[PDB]
Amino acid sequence: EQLKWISFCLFLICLLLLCIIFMLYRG
Amino acid sequence: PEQLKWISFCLFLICLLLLCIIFMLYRG
Amino acid sequence: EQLKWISFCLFLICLLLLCIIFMLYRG
Amino acid sequence: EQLKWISFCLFLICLLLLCIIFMLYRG
Amino acid sequence: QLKWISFCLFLICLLLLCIIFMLYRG
Q1: Looking at the partner chain, which of E1, E4, E18 has a beta carbon nearest the beta carbon of D21?
Q2: Which of the other chains make 3 or more beta carbon contacts under 8 angstroms with chain C?
Q3: Which among E2, E13, E20 has the least Cβ separation from residue C20?
Q4: Calculated CA dihedral for residues A16, D2, E5, C10, nearest 10 degrees
Q5: Residues 6 or more apart in contact with residue E18 via CB below 8 angstroms
Q6: How many other β-carbons are positioned within 10 Å of the β-carbon of residue A13?
C-alpha cells in the first residue's frame, strides 16, 4: 500500500507537468 | 504487477512531457 | 525501507513542481 | 522486469532535467 | 537496483531545487 501512493504521486506529476507546459505556451 | 505497469506508463508520459518543455525553451 | 524513501521524494517532487507552477503564474 | 524501465526512465529524466538547467544558464 | 531508483530520486529533487533557484535568480 506504499505502492498505491507512489502511483497516485506519478499521476499528479503528470498533471503538474501539463500545467507547466500550458503556462509556458501562455508566455 | 498491475501497479508497476501504471508507474511505467506514467514515467513514459513524464519523459514525453519533459521533452516538450525542453523543445519549448529551446524554441523561445 | 527504500519504498518509503521513494514515496517521500515523490511527494516532494509534487510540491516542488507545484511550487514551480506558482512561480510561473507569478510573472 | 519492468524495473529496468523505471530505472532507465529516471536515468533519462535527470538527463532531460540537466538539459533544462543548461538552457536556463546558457540562455 | 532500488538504490538507483533511490539515488536518481534524490538527484531529481536537487535538480528541481536547482531549477527553482535559477527561476528565483532572474
Answers
A1: E18
A2: A, E
A3: E20
A4: 30
A5: D21
A6: 21
